[PDB]
Amino acid sequence: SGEYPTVNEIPVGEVRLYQIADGVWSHIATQSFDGAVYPSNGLIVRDGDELLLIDTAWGAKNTAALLAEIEKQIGLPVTRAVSTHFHDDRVGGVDVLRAAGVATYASPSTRRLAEAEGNEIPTHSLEGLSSSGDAVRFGPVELFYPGAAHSTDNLVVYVPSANVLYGGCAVHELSSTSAGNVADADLAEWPTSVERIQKHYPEAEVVIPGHGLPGGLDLLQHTANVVKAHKN
Numbered sequence: 651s652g653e654y655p656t657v658n659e660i661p662v663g664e665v666r667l668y669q670i671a672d673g674v675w676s677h678i679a680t681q682s683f684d685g686a687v688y689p690s691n692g693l694i695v696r697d698g699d700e701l702l703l704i705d706t707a708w709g710a711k712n713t714a715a716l717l718a719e720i721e722k723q724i725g726l727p728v729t730r731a732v733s734t735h736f737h738d739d740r741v742g743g744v745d746v747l748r749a750a751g752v753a754t755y756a757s758p759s760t761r762r763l764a765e766a767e768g769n770e771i772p773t774h775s776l777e778g779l780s781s782s783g784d785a786v787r788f789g790p791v792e793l794f795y796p797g798a799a800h801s802t803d804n805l806v807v808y809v810p811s812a813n814v815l816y817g818g819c820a821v822h823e824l825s826s827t828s829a830g831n832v833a834d835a836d837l838a839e840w841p842t843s844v845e846r847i848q849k850h851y852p853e854a855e856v857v858i859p860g861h862g863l864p865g866g867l868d869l870l871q872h873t874a875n876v877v878k879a880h881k882n
């Protein structure tokens with residue numbers, strides 16, 4: 651009924667959308683992994699009379715449900731998708747997207763890691779993102795590579811029309827006490843990568859984490875703090 655939807659409010663398999671700004675939504679789904687249930691976010695950005703999708707809904711069936719939810723709530727076709735790193739909460743569902751007419755994209759780093767891990771592989775490579783601090787335009791967003799953080803390949807997404815920063819899994823929600831699933835992370839570089847985000851996007855008004863509730867710019871400093879303390 652209007653609050654940001656939480657893990658226990660979304661059965662696995664169902665997807666909700668949340669309006670962030672004009673022409674910007676998040677998508678929220680839930681999935682089981684190693685015997686626990688987790689929420690995860692992605693982004694939808696209006697691109698004229700089409701939509702740009704950022705990240706899958708963490709699985710094939712969830713991603714089919716995402717497409718259905720978009721059709722019901724928005725009614726514009728998803729034509730392109732970008733995955734912001736190689737884990738299943740970002741690429742699981744890419745095969746569904748591709749068979750629904752969506753062109754799927756990721757950095758070459760993400761594509762290599764997805765292939766090596768046995769995850770679904772976006773079709774198209776995003777060049778121009780291989781060095782930390784690189785940025786490229788992609789439709790109505792800017793893609794930014796901040797350096798290694800949650801993963802070595804993680805990208806962030808900025809929506810300049812709305813000053814929305816989608817941090818993906820490099821950014822944690824304010825309630826987080828932990829750095830999340832750090833198995834592929836660089837805890838030592840992560841603060842430095844967050845500082846790059848902070849420097850590059852000082853006018854962000856909304857910051858959306860990979861998992862959990864959006865907030866403001868404080869999510870960035872909180873993330874740095876949680877990661878340093880985890881390392882400690």
Ligand SMILES: C[C@H](OC(=O)c1ccc(CN)cc1)c1cccc2c(-c3ccc(CN4CCOCC4)nc3)c(C(=O)O)[nH]c12
Pocket residue numbers: 683688737738739767800819828829830831832833834860861
């Ligand atoms: C799909 C993703 O796979 C991986 O990352 C991965 C890594 C390595 C391998 C081995 N090849 C396999 C998979 C994944 C799977 C499962 C979970 C995650 C989490 C996550 C997010 C929040 C929290 C904090 N919660 C915990 C419970 O209650 C309170 C707060 N914990 C974890 C996060 C994330 O941090 O982004 N990515 C999660």
Ligand SMILES: [Zn+2]
Pocket residue numbers: 735737739800801819
């Ligand atoms: Zn991840």
Ligand SMILES: [Zn+2]
Pocket residue numbers: 737739819860861
């Ligand atoms: Zn994640």
